[PDB]
Design a protein around this nucleic acid. Sequence first.
DNA 1: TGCCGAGGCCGCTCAATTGGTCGTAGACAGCTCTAGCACCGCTTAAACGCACGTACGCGCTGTCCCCCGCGTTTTAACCGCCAAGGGGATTACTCCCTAGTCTCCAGGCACGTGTCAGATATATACATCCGA
DNA 2: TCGGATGTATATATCTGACACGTGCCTGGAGACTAGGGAGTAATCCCCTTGGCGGTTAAAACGCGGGGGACAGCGCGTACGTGCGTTTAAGCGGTGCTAGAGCTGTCTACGACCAATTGAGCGGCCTCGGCA
Lengths: 83, 79, 103, 107, 96, 91, 97, 97
Amino acid sequence: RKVLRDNIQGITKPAIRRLARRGGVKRISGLIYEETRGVLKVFLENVIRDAVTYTEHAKRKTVTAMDVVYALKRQGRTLYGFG
Amino acid sequence: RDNIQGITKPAIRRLARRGGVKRISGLIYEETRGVLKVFLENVIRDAVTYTEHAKRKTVTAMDVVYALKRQGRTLYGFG
Amino acid sequence: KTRSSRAGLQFPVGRVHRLLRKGNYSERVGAGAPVYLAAVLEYLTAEILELAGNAARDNKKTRIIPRHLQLAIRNDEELNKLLGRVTIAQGGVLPNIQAVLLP
Amino acid sequence: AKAKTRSSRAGLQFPVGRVHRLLRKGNYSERVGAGAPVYLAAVLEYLTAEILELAGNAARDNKKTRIIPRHLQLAIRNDEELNKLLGRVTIAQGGVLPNIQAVLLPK
Amino acid sequence: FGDSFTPYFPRVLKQVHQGLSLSQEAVSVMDSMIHDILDRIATEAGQLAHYTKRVTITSRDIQMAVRLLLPGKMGKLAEAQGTNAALRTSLCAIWQ
Amino acid sequence: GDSFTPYFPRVLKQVHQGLSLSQEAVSVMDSMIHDILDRIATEAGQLAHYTKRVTITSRDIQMAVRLLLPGKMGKLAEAQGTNAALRTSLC
Amino acid sequence: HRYRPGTVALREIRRYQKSTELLIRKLPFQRLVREIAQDFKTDLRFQSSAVMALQEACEAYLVGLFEDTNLCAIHAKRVTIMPKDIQLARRIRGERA
Amino acid sequence: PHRYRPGTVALREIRRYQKSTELLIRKLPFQRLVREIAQDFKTDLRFQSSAVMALQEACEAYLVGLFEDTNLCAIHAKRVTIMPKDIQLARRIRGER
DNA sequence: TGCCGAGGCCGCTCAATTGGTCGTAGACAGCTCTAGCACCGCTTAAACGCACGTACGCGCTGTCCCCCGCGTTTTAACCGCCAAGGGGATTACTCCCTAGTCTCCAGGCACGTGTCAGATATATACATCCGA
DNA sequence: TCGGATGTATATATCTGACACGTGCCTGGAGACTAGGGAGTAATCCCCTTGGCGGTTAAAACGCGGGGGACAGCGCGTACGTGCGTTTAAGCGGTGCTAGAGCTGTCTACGACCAATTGAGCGGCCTCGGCA
């Protein structure tokens, strides 16, 4: 149907570099990339797990912005601009 | 006043030992005194606000636990 | 006359009254409690909007955007401690560089 | 009549009526469901059994037969799930887990 | 629709600025933030009233919850705002 | 007041029969049970509020506890709760 | 030409500290979200607003963790972040015990 | 004329104070401190002994947590002697300054 | 230099406002007796100073290696547009659930009742650490 | 350094004190009933979202030099652990007062529910100057 494989590479090296520049750091070691990919992976794991549980409780096959904003609010990292 | 000096050097030394450190710098004493005074100030403010709302003059342990819980770090063994 | 007008305020006290009575924060609400709550909300809005309007007009722009709200929040210790874990959409950065980074 | 208890019907050891009263008292909503206090009692008893089993191990291995908060914090810190649930709690009479950074050890 | 504060965010600028205007994006952010602060202060007032064993959530409950949330500087200012608002409501009655 | 203190010895006896709680271990255990129950309850409450319902059902508690706990202990709690639910359903 | 290493680096720090457009390409992040999601419940669906919110939140979390690990690496008198820095900054924040 | 090698006594007292559980700050000084720091918030107050004990326990836990964190910090910079900069870094990463 | 957001216009309808009812939350008064407070003195555990050695924090220096910046090449993100049908959101209605009430009864509670494991202090042998 | 000194878990007799146990009881938990509405179920409709396809191009990949910076070594001088002697004030246990927590009552304004009214800002226009 919609089988998927290896999207973690979507967060490319220059994207991580631009994110770090936004963070305000000059140099970057080569080993930073894969581990920050893993960090993003586990963060998204927790966030979207809470979100999808919220959805399932509502008996909705789709995820809405309210779902993820509630998940993030519970995560101790609230969000604005969406309801 | 100097009542902050009640938290003496060997006291916080043993405290850091329980924390798991081997060496201490002399200025750590003053720095820890400062941060501890800040933490007190905050928790005591919240507790005294709770009490003032309850229209009381003492400070029940229950309102202290309320203040700690609301501050982020809860506390057990006191109900 | 309306209570909101009777209070000399700008927020509709009926709205916050309905919110409280719907927010199930208690079984019953007080008489003046919604008035006081509208007052504190109006004051907070006035303060944050002052800060945002300043942080926007100094940028030579006449349209407050969430970037300006981020500037206003991250430049006030009180609002920060109140809204530290907030991540506004189309915002979320404060311009600052550490000392040891510059040559 | 016939005097049968809901907790007894559930084969549990927690008072389901008590947690029902707690729920209705905490005004968490306007009305509570039938099976909701039953499920809550079940999950609470499971949590209690688990943490008490862990503390009992962490005490009996310590050659003592009396659970004190020290053993409770042993059991809490010695589990990742309990940590993720109770890592933001400071048990009375403390008893931080004993650990030492390997770099501090001598030659 | 929604029954929110958005019809009032612009009409307060005239008391704080002159020419600036809200963007259609930022107004929603401000509205959501105001709803969030409203909820965060109301739950604190309710928890306080429950702690004092009372069930009514009256003015004094909010007056204490606001200083419990907001620290000294802005807290006392908001408190004074609420107090003078209560005064203006009291002095304005059927007799005016 | 009403709490769980007279129950901890009961549940303990079925897992570590050769043991005994202290006079404060029961207190800290009771406070812990109280606050985690309050946490689960308020989670289920502000969860049922989202779906515009006003009640709190066993399904709400199930979703809340799965949303509040990670995989292993979460699923084990779900199993325990479902077993209790069906047991009550039997009688 | 070839600028001395460091000059161009500072430019892309002060520049991105003003604009706020997303730094991660939309489609790859959206596909990654779909991937990490499908394991929990199969063949889900997402409102574009929802995945945009995911991207915003993740960007904020990453930039926060990165400025924190930058502080870390500075404290070690270095100017190059390293995996140990990330690990320390995460342990102090309290998500890895 | 025997004398222990420098450092060993520190390890031994670490093992001790980590195995033990009792408080570490003298009661009356901490109580006097709570008194003098409370009277300015509201004058002429009273304190249940259990309440000041709870303050003591909470403060001990907070300090020991901050200390193990700052120890990790100071280790990260190849040192073994915690310095105030370590405290500032730990507090900033924990997010209260 | 261009066209869309917003000032100014006018008509509507439903949420705010008034008046009123009545059940009750609690404000207030009063009494009790509990725990906190201030103090009294005694013992000594612990804090304080000091001297001393030495472990290491730091600063410097040299090396070697590995990110940056740039140029070129590839690629897939993106944007527009078109389908399309899945389910999000909506209204209507019934029914099955809960709140609340009254009655009834046993689980937990408070009481006294024994009762044996748990902390104390002294002596034992061991783990460890540091000196050739 | 291996052996000797020192801190430490180990064995053994004590009492005592928190804890297992039988006895009334009562009050909260359970049973049964009813009345009313929250929501469970079901059409439906149309919003959007998922699929796809073409260009087109900004962005990612790859490579290459080269310089800055990470890192190992060392030395050196200082700040801190260690230990012993000294002061002090914490903690010990009584002891006495009393302000205030806490429990009871009760009377009153106070706040939810509700019938009736209206104008305020909400829907949709008309039109003008600034944000892009």
